[PDB]
Chain length 180, copies 4
């Protein structure tokens, strides 16, 4: 089974989490795992002004999402929604939606946040979009039950990285169960 | 695989939909399907005063939910939430939650509504609870993409019953794919 | 302006929060505050057996919600929704809905959790129902720090942690946010209604 | 009171709705209404190629949102969220957030869909962001029928159906609800702010 870890990160927190998710997924025999990012939409000038951490993962196109059996989406919490960069990217998946290309595939979500709350709303409002594509949504339950998170007030903790690894391992296991 | 269609209905609309969901699930070879209701919480006197349609399906206990591979939950739209009767019933599943008994099982939701809106919110706020139990959530996508619905202003339509049948068939098929 | 603090509590955490909300609201001259609870639906024997807390607050009827300018709703988090008791009570407000009785009145929400998860969803899924009634929804955001009566969660409404075992009680930091929420909502109610 | 109607539209449906919202708001003496759009993020060539509609409204900056007493946000439904363009714009309001610039101001939301699905989620997931800013959220409920300027969807905010092909335009029934939403919100803004 093919598993995509698809993420947006500005300051590296989701990037770190995405590596952990990928590690967990890679524990599952028969899971082929790849990590990609959505494009930065900010001109580099503005990204640098804001103190961003330049991302180096390969950039996904919206159309290649169709190639995977499971997609695990990472986004920072942005006032209780996904980031504009992830939203912009998902707004480019209209051609897949019309073709039913993601229908029935597994989806799961992880997030990063400060200490102000909103991470639950970010995850569940991301689920909405996944459901429009007919994706099967995988929460983590009481291994937020909605998906792995990292909370930075002011680097993810050991325990946060372990829950992220679990989410990857669990989703990848389901992907192999459904798809070989 | 064992599929439970678990519902609350006061005026029969969800009851009719539940039969359609069950029919669809029963199309799948290897799916064993049962339909049950959650208890009415209103004293019969008050249920009758309100013009309720007495329900005759076997009543589920909260604890038996653990026996199924997939649970398809039906609730009317009640100001954009599930009904109090379904909420009361799910508030009695604390013992299952602590034991992880529903973890990883398939869940899906259907609803009934008037013409005032709220059905999307009813379905997605039901998903939240399912996710606390670690259930895998199955939307219907563009077969609301969130689950089958029936809309009665002032009996479900042929097309509404067909989408409900589809939801049962699709969920049951996944249940057999995952569980034999 | 008349402000109702309407709550459900099984083990007393929301009850303590409700009292704090009412204390804050009472600070506003010209706000008449009252605290009421929704009925317990569990048979008394099962409630007592479960370690439920008996409570002094009068039991509200659905009809009387019409009599207030602002209603501040408290519910524990129950798998990311309001409690069955609060949901059952709100399902009895159909007559109010049909007459427009709550349209335009202020609403705000506070909650409690065992270990944190689901609080956000409890509050926002309660907002949905308030919106069907046409109520104006008041989140708390992150208020100016000098407006809290203690120096120093979510922007959706005040919350408190009960612990996995339910034995934790609200801290003064949590209660201060609850008091702020009451004061803020009551102030708005007086501004709109005298 | 100053009311901003801030919107995103690709094919003009939200634009037409925004104009209706502004018309309604303009009915309120003492409300100064303005309509602005968030920037298009698509390169002009791709936008034009996609059949996008060019628009007269001035482009808002994030900073200027601080200058209004009420902000009525319009966005099409994009898989049950606001558009990437509106989300990108709101992600630039961090400075406003930190200073409390929008705290306590009125917010309300309107939308559009191709075939209906997801409108409710678009509106309520936009409310989430408004709540992080501490804005007071105004749903429309089901208003008294005599307040609509046409005789005769959701209680969350006004919406309109564009059709699967995008060729449907808002009906006078839909626009009447949009006009009501503007009038209602502007009235509240004047009541709170003069
Ligand atoms: C515009 C904006 C909005 C934010 N909103 C929230 C929020 O709602 N809650 C919160 O606690 N943190 C919020 N944050 C902080 C980010 O979620 C947090 O810094 C996260 O770790 C960043 O992930 P990244 O390093 O992968 O970009 C926000 C940040 C930005 C830039
Ligand atoms: C308290 C209450 C609240 C309701 N809220 C809504 C609502 O939010 N939107 C709507 O269109 N219909 C609403 N309805 C109507 C029911 O969703 C509708 O009648 C449904 O068909 C009933 O399903 P049943 O026959 O299975 O009980 C509500 C009904 C009740 C009793
Ligand atoms: C059925 C049930 C479900 C619960 N769900 C959650 C939950 O989703 N998240 C959580 O942290 N605590 C959960 N709790 C703990 C309650 O939120 C806790 O008992 C409550 O906040 C205490 O408030 P009270 O003393 O006012 O009843 C649940 C409790 C029960 C009985
Ligand atoms: C990427 C994308 C996703 C969309 N998602 C939905 C949707 O979830 N539900 C729906 O009925 N229409 C959907 N639509 C149709 C838009 O809602 C429609 O184009 C919009 O309402 C028109 O508003 P506008 O003319 O102001 O851009 C989508 C359109 C795009 C481009």
């Amino acid at each position: 089974a093919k598993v995509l870890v698809l993420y947006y990160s500005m300051y590296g927190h989701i990037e770190t989490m995405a590596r952990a998710v990928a590690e967990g997924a890679s524990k599952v025999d028969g899971a082929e795992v790849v990590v990609k990012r959505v494009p930065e939409t900010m001109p580099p000038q503005l990204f640098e002004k804001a103190g961003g951490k330049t991302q180096t993962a390969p950039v996904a196109t919206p159309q290649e999402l169709a190639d995977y059996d499971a997609i695990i989406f990472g986004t920072p919490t942005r006032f209780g929604n996904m980031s504009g960069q992830m939203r912009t990217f998902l707004d480019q998946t209209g051609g897949l939606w019309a073709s039913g290309a993601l229908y029935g595939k597994l989806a799961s979500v992880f997030s990063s946040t400060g200490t102000g709350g909103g991470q639950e709303q970010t995850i569940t409002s991301t689920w909405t979009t996944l459901a429009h594509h007919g994706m099967v949504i995988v929460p983590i339950g009481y291994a937020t039950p909605y998906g792995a998170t990292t909370i930075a007030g002011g680097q993810p903790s050991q325990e946060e990285l372990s829950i992220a690894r679990y989410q990857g391992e669990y989703v990848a296991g389901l992907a192999v169960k459904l798809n070989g």
